[model samples]
Target: MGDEMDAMIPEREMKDFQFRALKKVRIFDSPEELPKERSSLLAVSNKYGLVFAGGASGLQIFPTKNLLIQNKPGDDPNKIVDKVQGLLVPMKFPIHHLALSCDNLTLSACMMSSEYGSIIAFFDVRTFSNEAKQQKRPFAYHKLLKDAGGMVIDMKWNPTVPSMVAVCLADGSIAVLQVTETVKVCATLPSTVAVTSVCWSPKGKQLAVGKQNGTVVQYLPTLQEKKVIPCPPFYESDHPVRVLDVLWIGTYVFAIVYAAADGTLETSPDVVMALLPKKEEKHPEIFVNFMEPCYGSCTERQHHYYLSYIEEWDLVLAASAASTEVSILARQSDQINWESWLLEDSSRAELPVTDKSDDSLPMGVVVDYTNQVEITISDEKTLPPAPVLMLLSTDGVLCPFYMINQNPGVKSLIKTPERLSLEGERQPKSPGST
Candidate 1:
C-alpha cells in the first residue's frame, strides 16, 4: 500500500523563463562616487515612491519617477541630473547594512566605526521631503550600540513584528532588539565565530545566523540555539568556508557560501545549500544542492551576493558577481523539488564584462511591486499587480525586469489528498489512514 501511494505522486521539474529587454536608468555619475565595496552598498524600496541607497559616505534618496524613467538611447548616460530628491550624511562612518520597517515608515541603518564601534540608527521616511525643502539633515529617532564589542556587520527586520530587528555583530553574537520610543536589546546569543549575516523566518518565530566558519545556527524567539549545522569545506580550499548570506523560505533555510578558489576570479564558484528540518530530528538535514558552482567570466571583482524575497510570487531572487546573469529559485505550492533559472538580459548589452583581476566592485539588488494596466479576459484577474525586479551593477546603472506571464491569478495545478481520495475507493488510502 505504501508503494502504491508513492507511485501515485507525479514527478516533474518546475522552471520556466521568458525573454524581455530590461530598462536601465542612470543613478550616479561614476562608480567612484558610490561605495566601492558591495558590503557598503545597500538599497531598499517601499510602497511609496521613495528609494534609499546607503553607502560609505551618506544616504541618497530618489523618487520612483527618477528610477523608472526610460533612458533614451541618446541621453547622457553619465550623469543623473536633477533626479536625486535628497541626500543626507547621517554619519561619517560607512553604512554596513540597511533595513526597512514592515510598515515602511522607518528606515534603519547600521554604521561601522573603528573608534566608536557599531551604531544602529533609525530614520523616519516621512520627514525626508520636509527636511530637503528646509535644507536640513534628516535625524534619527534613536541610536543604539554607541560603543560595543565589535562592528555590526548585518541587520534584518522581523517580517511578523514591525518594531523588532535582528542584528549580527562582528564579535560573533546576535542581538534581538525591540524598537519603540527608544531602542532596547531584547536578547543576545553568542557564537563561536563572527556572525556574518542573520535572517528571520517568514513566520518571525525562528532566527538563522551565518558564521564565518561556514556554520549555520538556528534559534527560537526565546534565544535558544535549536540546531547547529556545519557545512563541509568549500571545494577543498585552505581558506575557511564563510557563510556569506542566510535566507529563510518556508520551513527551510538557504545558506549562500563563498567557495571561490584562490586567484580564480572568473572560474571561481558560489554554492547554495538548502537545510531542511525533519519531523523527529533535532537538526535539519542538507536537503539538496540548490545552486552549484558554475564557470563564468568575472571581469568586475565582486565578492558578495544579494538576496531578497518576492512576496507576490513566493519566490527568491539572487544576484552576485559569480555571474553577470540574475537567477531565480522557486518551489511550487505542492511540489517537493525546487526549480531554478538563470535569467539574462534580453539585449545582453548591460551584461558585466570582466577582466581577470581581484579589485572589488559594487553590485546591489532590490525588489518591489509596481502597478501595470491589465487587459485579461477574466473579470476577477485584475486585482493587484505583481512585482518588478531591479538590479544595480558596478557601472552605477539600475536595470528593471519583470516576468511576462507572472500574474498571481493562476491556481495550483497539483492535487491534494482530500481531493484525490474522492476519485475512487480502490485507490491507495491516505498516508494517515489504516
Candidate 2:
C-alpha cells in the first residue's frame, strides 16, 4: 500500500550518518599533528582511501580495512595484529605536505629540510599485493624536484583537467603546475597572507585557496580572481583564524581551520569551521552556517586540522587537536537523530553534550575527547574506504580510525500531492480574547 502511494513522487535515497572506530594504530613514541606551518600528518587517496601518514621518521603507509579489521577468535582489543610489514619510506627531510595524485599513480611530498629550504619529491607507488617486504627489501625510490622557494602547504590534482595539480606554497604563491616526467609551474599567483590550502571545484572550473589570514579566495583555473569568501566576525577579540583546508560540496564551501582565541578557558565556544553558501539560502536555510572546534587545546591553537569528504556517502573526516582520536562528522539532517540509530545498543552514546552552547550546528558524531578517550560504534558501515580520521598527539600516540556509512535510506515527503484537512489537527486558542 505504501509503495503504491510512493509512485506519485520521485524515488530518492538519503542516509543517516554514524561512525564506527573499526581499528586504531599507534605510530609514534609521541606523534604530533605535524604542525600546520610544517605539514599535515595524513594524506588519503581520492577513492581507495589509501592513507599515507607523514611520520616523524619518514613515511608510513597503512593497509586498508580489508586486512586491518581481520581478527582471530578471542583477540585482544589493544593488540595490533594485522601488521604492515616493510612498507616504510625513509626520507631525508621531514615531509611537510603529502599529495597523492588523482590517478593514484604518483605520490608527491613537500619536504622541508630546515627553515631555510623546502622541496617536492615524487614516488611511483603502483604496486602489487605480493610486494610486501617478506624478508629484506629495497627502499622505495623517489625523485626530488628543484626547490620551490618555501614549504608546500597543500597540493591537489584537478581531475577535470587531468595532470594539472594545484600547489600551495608557503612563500605566498599558489601554482597551477604540471607534473608528469617533468614539472612546470604554468601559473602562479602570490597571496599576501601565505597560501596555506588549495582545492579544486568538482568540475575543475574554479579553484578555492585557503590563506593564513583566514580568507578563502575562489579563482578561475587561470588563477584569475573570483571573490574572497570572507570569514564573518564570530567574536570580539579579533583573534587569528587560519583556514586549514577548503572543500566544495555543491553550492557550499566547507572551510575548516584553527583559530587562536584570547587566553580563554577550554570552554570558550569559538567558531573553527566556516560552511559558506556561495549563494545565500532563501526559504528554509537548511544548511548550517558555522561549526567550532573543541576549546580544549591550550597549545597555541595550532593549525593542524585537515578535511576530507566522501561525496558519495556525505561523510567528513576532520582532525581535532583537542583529542587523541580524530573526528568523523556526518550530516544526517539539519538535526541528527543519532540516538535513534545506535547500531549495537550495547554501550552508551558519548554524544556531543553541547547543542545550544553558542551557535547552532547539525549535531552528529563528534567523538568528543574526555581526557583523550576514544569513541567506538562496533563496526557501523565502511563506505569506499573514503577518508579516515587520524590524530597524533604530542605524547606520541597516533590514532587512526575507520569511518562507516550507514544509509538507513531515509525518505521524506518532498512535495505532497495535496494538503490535508484540519479534521484531526489540534487547534490553537486565540491570543488574549479567547
Candidate 3:
C-alpha cells in the first residue's frame, strides 16, 4: 500500500523558482570573475560542508552547517571565526589564487609579493577531517614540489590533465608545468607586459593567453607560438584594451573596456566598462556582466574576474567591487507559458549603444535571451533544498543565499463528506431543487 500510494500520490517538483534573498551582508574580498573561475578570496567544494572564504586578510574555513546555524552557540568556547582547519588552525592568505582540485586531494594557491613576485604552494588535504569534528590536527600544508617562484596572476589545473597546470605571470609570461610528485616546467611563452589571464583547451592540446595590450594569442603545451586570436577587441580608443579572460568555448574573449570622458554621453561620465567576444565575429559581447545600470557609474577599472559559476545549483554568482550585495543570475524555463518573456513590454529594457569615438566598442551589455533550456519534469519525490551559496562583500561582510521551494503542485487523495451524496445511487437532490 505504501509503495502504490507513493506511485500515484508522489510529489511533483515543479520548475518554478525564485532566489531566496540574502537578509544578511557578509564581508569577503573580490571573488571569482569566471574562467578566472573559483577564487583568490573564496572557494567552495562540490563535496559537502567545505566552504573556504577570505577573512581578516587570510583564509577562513567554515562548516557549511554551522554557517546556517545563525546566532547559535556551541558547548566549545571556539568562536566561529576562530574555527579554521576543522575549526582549529587559522591560515594566512592574500592567496592571489586558490583552487581545490577535481580529485579533491590537494589545495593549491598562488600568493603574490613584491620581493619574490608570486609564490605558488600546493597543500595535500587528504588528512583534513570529515564533518565538523572539534578534534585539533596540523597536517603539512603543501604537497608536490614544495614552493615555486613567480608573480602568478592566475593558475589553472588542466581540464583534461589535472596534474599539469597553466600559469599566467604578472611579470609578463605564461608557463605550463607538471605538478605531480615531480615538479617541472614544460614551457614559458614570454611577453613584454603582464599576462592577465589564461585558459586551457577542452581537449588539453593548447591554451589561449590574454595580455594587457589586448593581444590574445594561442600557444601549445611546448610554448609553441600558434596564432593570434582574430579580430582583436579594444576600448573605444581604437587602441588595445586589457583582455581579462579567455574561453575555449565559443572562442570568446573578455576585456575590461574603459570609456574615457573627454566629451561623450546621453548619460554621465561612465569611466569604466567590460564585455566579451562573439563566436561569429571577433567582436566582444556581453557575457557575465548584468549589473550594468549600477556598474556603469564606477570610476575605477571594474574587475572582470569578479564573476563565478556555482556548478551544482546552476547559479552564476558575481561580486562587483561597487556592488551593494553579491548578485545572482539564475536559469529560467517555465513550462507555464510560451509568450511569457520575449515581448514588447519587458520592463525598463535597455538598448545597445556603441561608442561614439569608435563604433566597434559597444557601450551596453545586451546579453538577453538565454532564457530557455532543456528541463526535466519529475514527480517521484519532493525536491531538495537549494544549495548554500555564501558570498563575500568587497566592502567587508559575509553571508549566503538559497533558493526555497515554497508551493508545489502535487497529486493526492481528496477527502469529502460521505453524506454529501452517494455517487452511483440516485439521490433526491434534483427532486428537492425542482
Model 2 earns a TM-score of 0.63
- lDDT (CA) per prediction: 0.55, 0.48, 0.41
Model number with the top lDDT: 1
Off by over 4 Å in 3: 1-17, 22-39, 69-94, 113-117, 130-151, 202-205, 225-227, 231-239, 247-302, 309-317, 325-383, 403-434
> For residues 313-351, could you state the per-residue lDDT of candidate 3 as single tens digits?
333343433323333333334411111111122111121
CA deviation > 4 Å runs, candidate 1: 1-16, 19-22, 33-40, 71-91, 113-115, 131-151, 190-193, 230-240, 253-269, 273-277, 280-286, 292-302, 332-334, 342-362, 373-386, 406-434
Q: lDDT, candidate 2, residue 388?
A: 35
Please give the lDDT score for candidate 1. 0.55
Residue range 1-434, candidate 2, lDDT tens digits: 55655222211232334343333344444333323343555554434434566656777765433223422334554443333452567877777667666665556776766543666666544431224423211113222223554666567878676557888765567778776655666788766647777888877888888776767788887888897876545433457655656776444545345344332324322323345543655532222323443224433333444455545545455544443323344554552211112233311111121112221111011121111222332466323432333444343233344333445652321111122232322111222432
lDDT (tens digit, per residue) of candidate 1 on 1-434: 54755323222333334323234555543444324233534455455645676643467676644565433444543333333445654567766667777756557877766766677667655555444333323234334444554555567788878778887765567788877545677887665546767888888888888777677778886678897766653234456566767777766656465543232344344556475666767864654455442233454453555676655455666666545566666656664455555434342223332222222233556754442423232556442333345665555556554444343555322111111111111111222533
**Candidate with best TM-score:** 1
Question: Alpha carbon lDDT of residue 163, candidate 1?
Answer: 74
- Rank the candidate models, highest TM-score first: 1, 2, 3
lDDT-best of 1 and 3: 1
Tell me each candidate's TM-score. Answer: 0.71, 0.63, 0.55
